Design an enzyme around this catalytic site. Structure first.
Site, PDB file in Angstrom:
ATOM      1  N   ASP A  39      16.748 -14.321  -3.264  1.00  0.00           N
ATOM      2  CA  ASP A  39      16.964 -13.002  -2.661  1.00  0.00           C
ATOM      3  C   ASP A  39      17.907 -13.155  -1.473  1.00  0.00           C
ATOM      4  O   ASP A  39      18.729 -14.078  -1.460  1.00  0.00           O
ATOM      5  CB  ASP A  39      15.617 -12.389  -2.227  1.00  0.00           C
ATOM      6  CG  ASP A  39      15.612 -10.883  -2.262  1.00  0.00           C
ATOM      7  OD1 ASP A  39      16.391 -10.257  -1.505  1.00  0.00           O
ATOM      8  OD2 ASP A  39      14.828 -10.306  -3.061  1.00  0.00           O
ATOM      9  N   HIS A  69      15.150  -7.722   2.997  1.00  0.00           N
ATOM     10  CA  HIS A  69      14.494  -7.542   1.699  1.00  0.00           C
ATOM     11  C   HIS A  69      13.816  -8.826   1.241  1.00  0.00           C
ATOM     12  O   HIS A  69      12.686  -8.783   0.744  1.00  0.00           O
ATOM     13  CB  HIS A  69      15.547  -7.021   0.722  1.00  0.00           C
ATOM     14  CG  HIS A  69      15.106  -6.847  -0.698  1.00  0.00           C
ATOM     15  ND1 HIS A  69      15.094  -7.879  -1.608  1.00  0.00           N
ATOM     16  CD2 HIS A  69      14.814  -5.728  -1.402  1.00  0.00           C
ATOM     17  CE1 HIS A  69      14.742  -7.421  -2.796  1.00  0.00           C
ATOM     18  NE2 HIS A  69      14.558  -6.118  -2.694  1.00  0.00           N
ATOM     19  N   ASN A 161      14.766   0.042 -10.981  1.00  0.00           N
ATOM     20  CA  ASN A 161      14.342   1.284 -10.335  1.00  0.00           C
ATOM     21  C   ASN A 161      15.050   2.545 -10.850  1.00  0.00           C
ATOM     22  O   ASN A 161      15.223   3.519 -10.091  1.00  0.00           O
ATOM     23  CB  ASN A 161      14.545   1.238  -8.815  1.00  0.00           C
ATOM     24  CG  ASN A 161      13.623   0.255  -8.097  1.00  0.00           C
ATOM     25  OD1 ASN A 161      12.738  -0.364  -8.684  1.00  0.00           O
ATOM     26  ND2 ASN A 161      13.834   0.131  -6.783  1.00  0.00           N
ATOM     27  N   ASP A 200       5.887  -6.740 -19.135  1.00  0.00           N
ATOM     28  CA  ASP A 200       4.635  -7.469 -19.326  1.00  0.00           C
ATOM     29  C   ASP A 200       3.468  -6.901 -18.533  1.00  0.00           C
ATOM     30  O   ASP A 200       2.315  -7.005 -18.978  1.00  0.00           O
ATOM     31  CB  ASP A 200       4.820  -8.950 -18.952  1.00  0.00           C
ATOM     32  CG  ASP A 200       5.919  -9.608 -19.755  1.00  0.00           C
ATOM     33  OD1 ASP A 200       5.641 -10.074 -20.871  1.00  0.00           O
ATOM     34  OD2 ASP A 200       7.079  -9.667 -19.259  1.00  0.00           O
ATOM     35  N   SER A 224      11.238  -4.106  -6.672  1.00  0.00           N
ATOM     36  CA  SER A 224      11.379  -5.268  -5.797  1.00  0.00           C
ATOM     37  C   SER A 224      10.060  -5.675  -5.148  1.00  0.00           C
ATOM     38  O   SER A 224       9.799  -6.863  -4.932  1.00  0.00           O
ATOM     39  CB  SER A 224      12.372  -4.942  -4.677  1.00  0.00           C
ATOM     40  OG  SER A 224      13.714  -4.955  -5.106  1.00  0.00           O
TER      41      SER A 224
END
Ligand SMILES: [Ca+2]
Length: 279
Positions: A39, A69, A161, A200, A224
């Site tokens: 990230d 983030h 998203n 999943d 996220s």
């Protein structure tokens, strides 16, 4: 163990029911596992990590998180107050710039790197990767995530998203990884969550309180945010002897809360991450 007045998402992952505010877990709490947070970077010097976090690689002039983030995702994995597996080791791989953007070639190299570097770390209880990133479909990106998973890392990735079918996003759309969508505190699929056959599992990803840069904190939402709840859970469950990196995803899906989420499009799993912890 019990952590009272927990963030809603931690409470949710140790509850059969919505609407409780205490996180229960086995005290071993991920000791001897390690999670790579691929990230923007992690602010390791934030008090909430207690020396258990370190940058291991960057592709930019600095290793510093200038975004926030990656520190937030790291915090949900394994910060003392906001994390799932509060005794894990975190490692950080800055593949994204301080505006949250990255080229796929650098994203792929970071996955490769993690596949090798796990041989330079002491992670006796196993290794998990947490990937709260993505974009439009790319087979090379999927292939890297597949390689990372095959090497012996448990790969968890965000579904995206777009309120869309995740089959058109990578690495979301790689069947070998664990693709994670987000729910809210009322047990609804989060409004922006992707969906579809390839998802999943769901985890908490609306209004998620965690560590931020500046030694600070904030509450934010996204696929996220759902992803690092599953990573820490996998770290936690590996330390407990309950599963392996190759089987973790499957074991999480099989032992999940079933059928409790609303706002689920036909053909998407109605499954919510759950630690199964009985004090
Ligand atoms: Ca899978």
């Amino acid at each position: 163990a019990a952590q009272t007045n927990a963030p809603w998402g931690l409470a949710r992952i140790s509850s059969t029911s919505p609407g409780t505010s205490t996180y229960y877990y086995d005290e071993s709490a991920g000791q001897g596992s390690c999670v790579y947070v691929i990230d923007t970077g992690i602010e390791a010097s934030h008090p909430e990590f207690e020396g258990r976090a370190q940058m291991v690689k960057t592709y930019y002039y600095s290793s510093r998180d200038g975004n926030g983030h990656g520190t937030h995702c790291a915090g949900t994995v394994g910060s003392r107050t906001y994390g799932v597996a509060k005794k894990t080791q975190l490692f950080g791989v800055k593949v994204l710039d301080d505006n949250g953007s990255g080229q796929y070639s650098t994203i792929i190299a970071g996955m490769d790197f993690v596949a090798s570097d796990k041989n330079n770390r002491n992670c006796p209880k196993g290794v998990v990767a947490s990937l709260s990133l993505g974009g439009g479909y790319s087979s090379s990106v999927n292939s890297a995530a597949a390689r990372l998973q095959s090497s012996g890392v448990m790969v968890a990735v965000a579904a995206g998203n777009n309120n869309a079918d995740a089959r058109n996003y990578s690495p979301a759309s790689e069947p070998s990884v664990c693709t994670v969508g987000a729910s809210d505190r009322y047990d609804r699929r989060s409004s922006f969550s992707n969906y579809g056959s390839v998802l999943d599992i769901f985890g908490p990803g609306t209004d998620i309180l965690s560590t931020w840069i500046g030694g600070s904190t904030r509450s934010i939402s996204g696929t996220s945010m759902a992803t690092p709840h599953v990573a820490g859970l996998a770290a936690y469950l590996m330390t407990l002897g309950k599963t392996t990196a190759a089987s973790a995803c499957r074991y999480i899906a099989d032992t999940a809360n079933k059928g409790d989420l609303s706002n689920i499009p036909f053909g998407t799993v109605n499954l919510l991450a759950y630690n199964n912890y009985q004090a």
